[PDB]
Ligand binder design. Structure first.
Ligand SMILES: Nc1ncnc2c1ncn2[C@@H]1O[C@H](COP(=O)(O)OP(=O)(O)O)[C@@H](O)[C@H]1O
Ligand SMILES: Nc1ncnc2c1ncn2[C@@H]1O[C@H](COP(=O)(O)OP(=O)(O)O)[C@@H](O)[C@H]1O
Ligand SMILES: [Mg+2]
Ligand SMILES: [Mg+2]
Lengths: 313, 313
């Protein structure tokens, strides 16, 4: 069967308005796992990645409160991303191996903790723009800046929050092992959250506090495993021109040259759809057969080419 | 080369007195990685596990403070164990691959998120007695007992705590994939903290809230990967008879028949050295060639048979 990387998004774990309690996440993950299980029953070789923004944000909230109440040290963002990969990957590997056993299918399903390499001279480290963590007042946010070297900015009028770098993913430290597992039929969950951001210097891989886009990092995983198809599943069913306006037009089959023109026109917003269109464009430019942007609830119909945005060479 | 499962303990990550800051843990994991890289330079096939008691403890304190301050949901103990495997695995896989890379050894090092199967009829579930989490007052602890189904007890005069089961590990969900990676020469970190505790019910894997002893779970990982040697690294250089008294004798080479008799005499305290000697006894009874209990800082000499307790058939 064809090999597909499926990059899950927020809605695989949390619905609009949910705080992300354990029971909420267990229900959303089981719904996700039935869609993936359908795709595995159809014969596809599946590799899974996902986001972690709300989950790393909850861990940063928790550790700021722990440090204030019990005096125990808060851990840095690379550690919070590794914690998130163990959390989310445990819930997806247990629900997907259980839904495949319910279908009379025995498969091996594992999470591999993944480090994503970026260039230490990436220009994003000179200009951090992604807001993250708790909302602080001005006084606490500027004291944290002085003491820790953080950058802060007032965020949409809700308080002050750290801003961190969003560097471009170059590749994964564990790519060789990830591909070996895929080639032997294991369903691997990797690059969770975009992976832990790391740079290489003086022999050592070292964590850095940043966010890597999970669709851009997912596209690099798709190159690394030699995937045929790269599919992004989100909470809208594709990419639209003139989104939210009276001229709104949902893209269906679109050639990559046309999608690149649409991209420079600005239709795909930078905090959201822009990087998913960029990742689909890059996968086609690398040589992939098809990239897809669709809604999680239409994963299977999308994968067959019937709905969603379908990007071709 | 001989295949060895190395079961690290507290001192691989924290020393006496430390709270467990990132910088403390990064320094202790670097020291651990220099020991293991020398073993790998010597041609052994290594598999690594470790404990997670202080690190799941910190996460339970952080999430009770987070839910109390920000109203975000705390997650249950199986999820906190998964978070701990991601956090500790990422640090050891980064440090160990860095020491191998600087010494001119290119080796793959990865953490697999591991679930440890226990028997749902284990008598431990009828008698929980390991205290975990924050110290509460009696009202708060008995309200949580009513609302959540917890068992609480007053712990050593410091307040009331939840008590959980400590079931015997039977095997690991991921054992076949772990062993296939070891046979391909990947250095695997697995069963961290004893693994996420899970039962099997009607074919479905379900998490439970419990602690699984990391040395007993380490010995079952050694059975599953067909290890030759099982080596526990701790903060004392072996097991002693009549520990702390005038009759004290530190065991060097010991045969399993004698060591079972000493175990029955009660020399090895149940919350510390007892499970280490039980796990060494079990590895020799399963058919292993040698089980070792030694100090972390003397790991190479101990694997060579020159120091520490050396348990033989
Ligand atoms: N041109 C566009 N077409 C479609 N959706 C768009 C567009 N521009 C912005 N969006 C937003 O992109 C959002 C999906 O991205 P995002 O919220 O980051 O989700 P995920 O967690 O799946 O990555 C949609 O809910 C939509 O509101
Ligand atoms: N018979 C004994 N021989 C040696 N050490 C013992 C014995 N009984 C108890 N101990 C204690 O076991 C401790 C090591 O176990 P533990 O503290 O649980 O460490 P780890 O984190 O490595 O599992 C030693 O520091 C020692 O105080
Ligand atoms: Mg997004
Ligand atoms: Mg111990």
């Amino acid at each position: 069967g064809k090999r597909v990387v499926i990059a899950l998004g927020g809605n695989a774990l949390q619905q609009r308005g949910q705080k992300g309690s354990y029971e909420e996440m267990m229900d959303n993950v089981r719904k996700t796992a039935r869609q993936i299980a359908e795709i595995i029953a159809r014969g596809y070789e599946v590799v899974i990645t996902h986001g972690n923004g709300p989950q790393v944000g909850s861990l940063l909230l928790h550790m700021d409160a722990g440090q204030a109440t019990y005096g125990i040290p808060a851990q840095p963002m690379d550690v919070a991303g590794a914690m998130s990969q163990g959390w989310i990957g445990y819930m997806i590997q247990q629900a997907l191996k259980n839904e495949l056993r319910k279908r009379g299918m025995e498969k091996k399903v594992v999470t591999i903790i993944t480090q994503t390499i970026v260039d230490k001279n990436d220009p994003a480290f000179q200009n951090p723009t992604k807001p993250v963590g708790p909302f602080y007042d001005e006084e606490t946010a500027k004291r944290l800046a002085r003491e820790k070297g953080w950058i802060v900015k007032e965020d949409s009028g809700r308080g002050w929050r750290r801003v961190v770098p969003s560097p471009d993913p170059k590749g994964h430290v564990e790519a060789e092992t990830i591909k070996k597992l895929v080639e032997r039929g294991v369903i691997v969950i990797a690059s969770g959250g975009g992976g832990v951001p790391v740079i290489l210097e003086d022999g050592e891989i070292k964590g850095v506090e940043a966010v890597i886009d999970k669709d851009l990092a997912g596209e690099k995983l798709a190159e690394e495993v030699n995937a045929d198809i790269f599919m992004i599943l989100t909470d809208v069913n594709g990419a639209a021109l003139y989104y939210g306006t009276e001229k709104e037009q949902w893209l269906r089959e679109v050639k990559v040259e046309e999608l690149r023109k649409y991209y420079e026109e600005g239709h795909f917003k930078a905090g959201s759809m822009g990087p998913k269109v960029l990742a689909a464009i890059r996968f086609i430019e690398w040589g992939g057969e098809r990239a897809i942007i669709a809604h999680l609830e239409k994963a299977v119909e999308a994968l067959e080419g019937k709905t969603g945005t379908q990007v071709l060479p």
